[PDB]
Amino acid sequence: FEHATTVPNVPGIPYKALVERAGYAPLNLEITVVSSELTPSTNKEYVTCKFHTVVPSPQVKCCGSLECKASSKADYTCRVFGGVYPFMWGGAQCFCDSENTQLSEAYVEFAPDCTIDHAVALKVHTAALKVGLRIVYGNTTARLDTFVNGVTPGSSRDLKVIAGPISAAFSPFDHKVVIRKGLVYNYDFPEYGAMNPGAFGDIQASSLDATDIVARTDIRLLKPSVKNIHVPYTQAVSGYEMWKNNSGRPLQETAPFGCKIEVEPLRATNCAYGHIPISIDIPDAAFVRSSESPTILEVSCTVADCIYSADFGGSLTLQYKANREGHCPVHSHSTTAVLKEATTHVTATGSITLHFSTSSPQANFIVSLCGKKTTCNAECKPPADHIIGEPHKVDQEFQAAVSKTSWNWLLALFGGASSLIVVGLIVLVCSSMLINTR
Amino acid sequence: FEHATTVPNVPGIPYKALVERAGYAPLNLEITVVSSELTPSTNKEYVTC
Ligand SMILES: *[C@@H]1O[C@H](CO)[C@@H](O)[C@H](O)[C@H]1NC(C)=O
């Protein structure tokens, strides 16, 4: 048999649901979402890091002329200078008064340590959600893991189960993301092929060890002004360090709904938002015929005490009269309250206590014991402790916080002035015929 | 759990009170004032004889 149900997408909060079939006792269905896994699609854009300026030994032509030549190295900057007079520890290296000329070229390359300090800029899209479910029926447990899409049933014991699609899509990831040393940042990294000195992504490479690099970082050579040989270079500060200084907080301290984010797939995990519609198919053999199910008679409630607490602190008692020994299932059909146990032993005239949680002070609802029902009600109070860190609001509030006494107060407050105007019009027409008498 | 009371300051008169918590059976609580003790602060002015 196939049964459909909507469950909140949140870990550690089981959901109880029943299946009704003629001739078969109701079967408890417990559904738990063990862990969420939001894994989006990503395409590496480029990788950047701190760079390092190669300053190769300047070329010098003694007493002759020379010309600059371009090269394919990244940020290559070449410039000639005439009138130079190179000097070294050995003294003069060229000998001609101002005829000699020196050519200086510089370029940039990623520093070796980058091999571990690299930062990769990624583009994200088409977030996909994966849910792991545990289903309990007839004190039998089964596991599965399925994509949220409602067209790819999972495989578990050759059982097909379908989930989703999500009610409202949620994704903490933004179109442009940055990764470095296990940390993820939100940032609009410049597109590959576009560079801006003194900012993130001033050195860009397709791969960490790509021989081909493209990058401009505003290197301008200077005319030598010292006796000995020396090539003076001036350039802007590396952009990667500047981003590092003010990069801001990572995404672990900004993701809503407490998504725990792992880098290597770059996926969020174990966060809650939305409702999952799921259709579960149970084998028929799992069902038990009502003939062998225990028969109960003369059931009733007694609310020993109930506390309108966030945690599961409400108590209840049920009194039953039966004839056969066995186990029968129990449940609360009112969404505002959820029980704790699903099945209980049944005796000839036994009574059993149960634990339940509610999201309203007026705890009034219908509780099904085995195949029978019993309506019953009581009043709960707010708790002394108002902050706790355990599963809360097993059912969301449904504007049911209004108490029965408050309902009665509001009902009695309102009066029928409309009836009074109607009576006024009626007596007015009566007076009208009276005037017709006069 | 914290629970407050007002008791008569007098020895040999036990006071019985309860604590109410949902899901917990009521717990008796007996308070007895074994002996009072009032000590004032003093200074020695002088002595005579
Ligand atoms: C499950 O419940 C049925 C009904 O009482 C019982 O016969 C069966 O032994 C239970 N199975 C386990 C593993 O407890």
Short mmCIF file of N, CA and C in Angstrom, two decimals, chain A residues 9-109:
data_model
loop_
_atom_site.label_atom_id
_atom_site.label_comp_id
_atom_site.label_asym_id
_atom_site.label_seq_id
_atom_site.Cartn_x
_atom_site.Cartn_y
_atom_site.Cartn_z
N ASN A 9 11.39 19.38 6.99
CA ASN A 9 12.79 19.06 6.68
C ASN A 9 13.65 19.57 7.82
N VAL A 10 13.91 18.70 8.79
CA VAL A 10 14.70 19.07 9.96
C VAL A 10 15.15 17.79 10.66
N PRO A 11 16.43 17.64 10.98
CA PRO A 11 16.90 16.37 11.55
C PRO A 11 16.50 16.19 13.01
N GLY A 12 16.41 14.92 13.40
CA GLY A 12 16.19 14.58 14.80
C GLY A 12 14.80 14.84 15.32
N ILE A 13 13.80 14.95 14.45
CA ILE A 13 12.42 15.15 14.88
C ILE A 13 11.53 14.14 14.16
N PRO A 14 11.50 12.89 14.62
CA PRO A 14 10.65 11.88 13.96
C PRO A 14 9.22 12.35 13.74
N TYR A 15 8.52 11.69 12.81
CA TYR A 15 7.13 11.98 12.49
C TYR A 15 6.36 10.67 12.49
N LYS A 16 5.22 10.66 13.18
CA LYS A 16 4.37 9.48 13.29
C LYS A 16 3.16 9.64 12.38
N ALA A 17 2.86 8.60 11.61
CA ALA A 17 1.70 8.60 10.74
C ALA A 17 1.13 7.19 10.66
N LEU A 18 -0.17 7.10 10.41
CA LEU A 18 -0.88 5.83 10.37
C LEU A 18 -1.38 5.54 8.96
N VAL A 19 -1.58 4.25 8.69
CA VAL A 19 -2.16 3.76 7.45
C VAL A 19 -3.41 2.97 7.79
N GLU A 20 -4.51 3.29 7.13
CA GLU A 20 -5.81 2.69 7.43
C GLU A 20 -6.22 1.80 6.26
N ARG A 21 -6.49 0.53 6.56
CA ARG A 21 -6.98 -0.42 5.57
C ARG A 21 -8.03 -1.31 6.22
N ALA A 22 -9.10 -1.59 5.48
CA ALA A 22 -10.17 -2.42 6.01
C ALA A 22 -9.67 -3.83 6.31
N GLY A 23 -9.97 -4.32 7.50
CA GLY A 23 -9.56 -5.65 7.92
C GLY A 23 -8.16 -5.74 8.47
N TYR A 24 -7.40 -4.65 8.45
CA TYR A 24 -6.03 -4.62 8.95
C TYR A 24 -5.92 -3.56 10.04
N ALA A 25 -5.26 -3.91 11.14
CA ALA A 25 -5.05 -2.96 12.21
C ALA A 25 -4.16 -1.82 11.72
N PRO A 26 -4.35 -0.60 12.24
CA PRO A 26 -3.48 0.50 11.82
C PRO A 26 -2.02 0.20 12.12
N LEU A 27 -1.15 0.57 11.19
CA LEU A 27 0.28 0.30 11.30
C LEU A 27 1.03 1.60 11.54
N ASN A 28 1.85 1.62 12.58
CA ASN A 28 2.64 2.80 12.89
C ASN A 28 3.74 3.00 11.86
N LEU A 29 3.88 4.24 11.39
CA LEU A 29 4.94 4.63 10.45
C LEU A 29 5.71 5.77 11.08
N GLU A 30 6.97 5.52 11.43
CA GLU A 30 7.86 6.54 11.97
C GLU A 30 8.88 6.92 10.91
N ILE A 31 8.98 8.22 10.62
CA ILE A 31 9.86 8.73 9.58
C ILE A 31 10.85 9.69 10.23
N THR A 32 12.14 9.48 9.98
CA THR A 32 13.18 10.35 10.51
C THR A 32 14.13 10.75 9.39
N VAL A 33 14.47 12.03 9.33
CA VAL A 33 15.47 12.53 8.39
C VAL A 33 16.80 12.58 9.12
N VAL A 34 17.68 11.63 8.80
CA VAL A 34 18.94 11.50 9.53
C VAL A 34 19.84 12.70 9.27
N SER A 35 19.93 13.15 8.02
CA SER A 35 20.82 14.24 7.68
C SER A 35 20.51 14.74 6.28
N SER A 36 20.54 16.05 6.12
CA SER A 36 20.38 16.68 4.82
C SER A 36 21.73 16.86 4.15
N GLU A 37 21.71 17.00 2.82
CA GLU A 37 22.94 17.13 2.05
C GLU A 37 22.62 17.93 0.79
N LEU A 38 22.92 19.22 0.81
CA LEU A 38 22.71 20.11 -0.33
C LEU A 38 24.03 20.23 -1.07
N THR A 39 24.12 19.60 -2.23
CA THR A 39 25.34 19.58 -3.04
C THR A 39 25.08 20.27 -4.38
N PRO A 40 25.54 21.50 -4.59
CA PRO A 40 25.30 22.18 -5.86
C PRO A 40 26.36 21.85 -6.90
N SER A 41 26.06 22.24 -8.14
CA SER A 41 26.97 22.04 -9.26
C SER A 41 27.94 23.21 -9.35
N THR A 42 29.22 22.91 -9.55
CA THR A 42 30.27 23.92 -9.55
C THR A 42 31.19 23.70 -10.74
N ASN A 43 31.76 24.80 -11.22
CA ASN A 43 32.75 24.77 -12.30
C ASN A 43 33.90 25.68 -11.91
N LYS A 44 35.09 25.09 -11.76
CA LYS A 44 36.26 25.87 -11.39
C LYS A 44 36.50 26.97 -12.42
N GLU A 45 36.74 28.19 -11.94
CA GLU A 45 37.03 29.32 -12.80
C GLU A 45 38.52 29.61 -12.91
N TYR A 46 39.20 29.76 -11.78
CA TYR A 46 40.64 30.00 -11.78
C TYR A 46 41.14 29.93 -10.34
N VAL A 47 42.46 30.07 -10.19
CA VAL A 47 43.14 29.95 -8.91
C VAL A 47 44.16 31.08 -8.80
N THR A 48 44.20 31.72 -7.64
CA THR A 48 45.08 32.85 -7.39
C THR A 48 45.79 32.65 -6.06
N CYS A 49 46.84 33.44 -5.84
CA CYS A 49 47.63 33.35 -4.62
C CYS A 49 48.65 34.49 -4.62
N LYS A 50 49.41 34.57 -3.53
CA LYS A 50 50.52 35.52 -3.47
C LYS A 50 51.51 35.23 -4.59
N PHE A 51 52.05 36.29 -5.19
CA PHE A 51 52.95 36.15 -6.31
C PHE A 51 54.37 36.56 -5.91
N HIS A 52 55.27 36.50 -6.89
CA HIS A 52 56.69 36.67 -6.65
C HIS A 52 57.30 37.23 -7.93
N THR A 53 58.04 38.33 -7.80
CA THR A 53 58.56 39.05 -8.96
C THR A 53 59.94 38.52 -9.32
N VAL A 54 60.02 37.84 -10.46
CA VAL A 54 61.32 37.48 -11.03
C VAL A 54 61.95 38.75 -11.59
N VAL A 55 63.22 38.96 -11.27
CA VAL A 55 63.94 40.14 -11.75
C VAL A 55 65.23 39.65 -12.39
N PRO A 56 65.18 39.07 -13.59
CA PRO A 56 66.37 38.45 -14.16
C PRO A 56 67.49 39.47 -14.37
N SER A 57 68.71 38.96 -14.37
CA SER A 57 69.87 39.82 -14.47
C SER A 57 69.77 40.69 -15.72
N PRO A 58 69.92 42.00 -15.61
CA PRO A 58 69.71 42.87 -16.77
C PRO A 58 70.71 42.57 -17.88
N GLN A 59 70.25 42.68 -19.12
CA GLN A 59 71.16 42.60 -20.25
C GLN A 59 71.87 43.94 -20.42
N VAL A 60 73.13 43.89 -20.83
CA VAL A 60 73.92 45.10 -21.03
C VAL A 60 74.69 44.97 -22.33
N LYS A 61 74.67 46.03 -23.14
CA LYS A 61 75.48 46.12 -24.34
C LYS A 61 76.50 47.22 -24.12
N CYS A 62 77.78 46.84 -24.12
CA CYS A 62 78.87 47.77 -23.85
C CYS A 62 79.22 48.51 -25.13
N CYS A 63 79.01 49.82 -25.14
CA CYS A 63 79.42 50.71 -26.22
C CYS A 63 78.65 50.45 -27.51
N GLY A 64 77.40 49.99 -27.40
CA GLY A 64 76.58 49.73 -28.57
C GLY A 64 75.13 50.07 -28.34
N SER A 65 74.26 49.69 -29.27
CA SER A 65 72.84 49.95 -29.18
C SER A 65 72.07 48.64 -29.02
N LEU A 66 70.90 48.74 -28.39
CA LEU A 66 70.07 47.57 -28.15
C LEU A 66 68.61 48.00 -28.17
N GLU A 67 67.73 47.03 -28.43
CA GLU A 67 66.30 47.28 -28.56
C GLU A 67 65.52 46.28 -27.72
N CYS A 68 64.37 46.73 -27.22
CA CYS A 68 63.52 45.88 -26.41
C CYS A 68 62.81 44.84 -27.28
N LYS A 69 62.43 43.73 -26.64
CA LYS A 69 61.69 42.66 -27.30
C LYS A 69 60.64 42.12 -26.34
N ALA A 70 59.43 41.92 -26.85
CA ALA A 70 58.35 41.41 -26.04
C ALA A 70 58.49 39.90 -25.85
N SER A 71 57.82 39.39 -24.82
CA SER A 71 57.85 37.97 -24.50
C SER A 71 56.47 37.52 -24.05
N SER A 72 56.32 36.22 -23.84
CA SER A 72 55.04 35.62 -23.51
C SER A 72 54.83 35.44 -22.01
N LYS A 73 55.81 35.78 -21.18
CA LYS A 73 55.66 35.61 -19.74
C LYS A 73 54.60 36.57 -19.20
N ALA A 74 54.00 36.18 -18.08
CA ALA A 74 52.93 36.98 -17.50
C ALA A 74 53.46 38.32 -17.01
N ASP A 75 52.71 39.38 -17.31
CA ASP A 75 53.03 40.73 -16.86
C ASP A 75 54.43 41.17 -17.30
N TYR A 76 54.94 40.59 -18.38
CA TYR A 76 56.28 40.94 -18.84
C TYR A 76 56.38 42.43 -19.09
N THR A 77 57.41 43.05 -18.53
CA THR A 77 57.66 44.48 -18.70
C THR A 77 59.13 44.67 -19.02
N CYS A 78 59.41 45.22 -20.21
CA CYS A 78 60.76 45.37 -20.72
C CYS A 78 61.01 46.83 -21.05
N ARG A 79 62.19 47.33 -20.69
CA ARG A 79 62.53 48.71 -20.99
C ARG A 79 64.04 48.85 -21.13
N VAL A 80 64.46 49.68 -22.07
CA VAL A 80 65.87 49.95 -22.31
C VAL A 80 66.24 51.26 -21.64
N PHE A 81 67.54 51.45 -21.42
CA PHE A 81 68.05 52.71 -20.90
C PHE A 81 69.42 52.97 -21.52
N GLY A 82 69.57 54.14 -22.12
CA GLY A 82 70.83 54.58 -22.67
C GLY A 82 71.57 55.50 -21.71
N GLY A 83 72.88 55.59 -21.91
CA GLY A 83 73.72 56.37 -21.03
C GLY A 83 74.07 55.70 -19.72
N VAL A 84 73.62 54.47 -19.50
CA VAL A 84 73.94 53.76 -18.27
C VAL A 84 75.45 53.54 -18.19
N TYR A 85 75.95 53.40 -16.96
CA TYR A 85 77.36 53.13 -16.72
C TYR A 85 77.46 52.05 -15.65
N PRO A 86 77.36 50.78 -16.04
CA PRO A 86 77.34 49.72 -15.03
C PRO A 86 78.65 49.65 -14.27
N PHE A 87 78.55 49.42 -12.97
CA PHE A 87 79.71 49.27 -12.11
C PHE A 87 79.48 48.10 -11.17
N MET A 88 80.57 47.41 -10.83
CA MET A 88 80.49 46.22 -10.02
C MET A 88 81.68 46.20 -9.08
N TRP A 89 81.73 45.18 -8.22
CA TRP A 89 82.87 45.06 -7.32
C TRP A 89 84.17 45.06 -8.11
N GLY A 90 84.17 44.39 -9.26
CA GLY A 90 85.34 44.42 -10.11
C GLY A 90 85.59 45.75 -10.77
N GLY A 91 84.66 46.69 -10.65
CA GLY A 91 84.83 48.01 -11.24
C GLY A 91 83.90 48.23 -12.41
N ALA A 92 84.43 48.85 -13.47
CA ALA A 92 83.64 49.10 -14.66
C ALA A 92 83.51 47.83 -15.49
N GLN A 93 82.28 47.50 -15.89
CA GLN A 93 82.04 46.34 -16.73
C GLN A 93 81.96 46.69 -18.21
N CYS A 94 81.53 47.91 -18.55
CA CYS A 94 81.56 48.41 -19.91
C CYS A 94 82.39 49.69 -19.93
N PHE A 95 82.94 50.01 -21.10
CA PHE A 95 83.84 51.16 -21.24
C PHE A 95 83.51 51.90 -22.54
N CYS A 96 82.59 52.86 -22.42
CA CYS A 96 82.29 53.85 -23.45
C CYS A 96 81.39 54.89 -22.82
N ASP A 97 81.75 56.17 -22.94
CA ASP A 97 81.08 57.22 -22.18
C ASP A 97 79.68 57.44 -22.73
N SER A 98 78.69 56.81 -22.09
CA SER A 98 77.26 56.96 -22.34
C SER A 98 76.79 56.18 -23.57
N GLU A 99 77.68 55.53 -24.31
CA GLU A 99 77.24 54.75 -25.47
C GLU A 99 76.62 53.42 -25.07
N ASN A 100 77.12 52.80 -24.01
CA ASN A 100 76.56 51.54 -23.53
C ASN A 100 75.10 51.72 -23.13
N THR A 101 74.33 50.64 -23.22
CA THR A 101 72.92 50.68 -22.89
C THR A 101 72.49 49.38 -22.25
N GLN A 102 71.59 49.47 -21.26
CA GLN A 102 71.16 48.30 -20.50
C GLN A 102 69.66 48.10 -20.65
N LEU A 103 69.27 46.86 -20.89
CA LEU A 103 67.88 46.46 -21.03
C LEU A 103 67.47 45.67 -19.79
N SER A 104 66.39 46.12 -19.14
CA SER A 104 65.88 45.47 -17.94
C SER A 104 64.47 44.95 -18.21
N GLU A 105 64.23 43.69 -17.86
CA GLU A 105 62.92 43.07 -18.00
C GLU A 105 62.54 42.40 -16.70
N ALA A 106 61.24 42.44 -16.39
CA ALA A 106 60.72 41.83 -15.17
C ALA A 106 59.39 41.15 -15.47
N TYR A 107 59.08 40.13 -14.68
CA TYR A 107 57.80 39.44 -14.78
C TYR A 107 57.46 38.82 -13.43
N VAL A 108 56.31 38.16 -13.37
CA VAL A 108 55.75 37.67 -12.12
C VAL A 108 55.42 36.19 -12.25
N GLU A 109 55.47 35.48 -11.12
CA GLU A 109 55.16 34.06 -11.09
C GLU A 109 54.66 33.70 -9.70
#
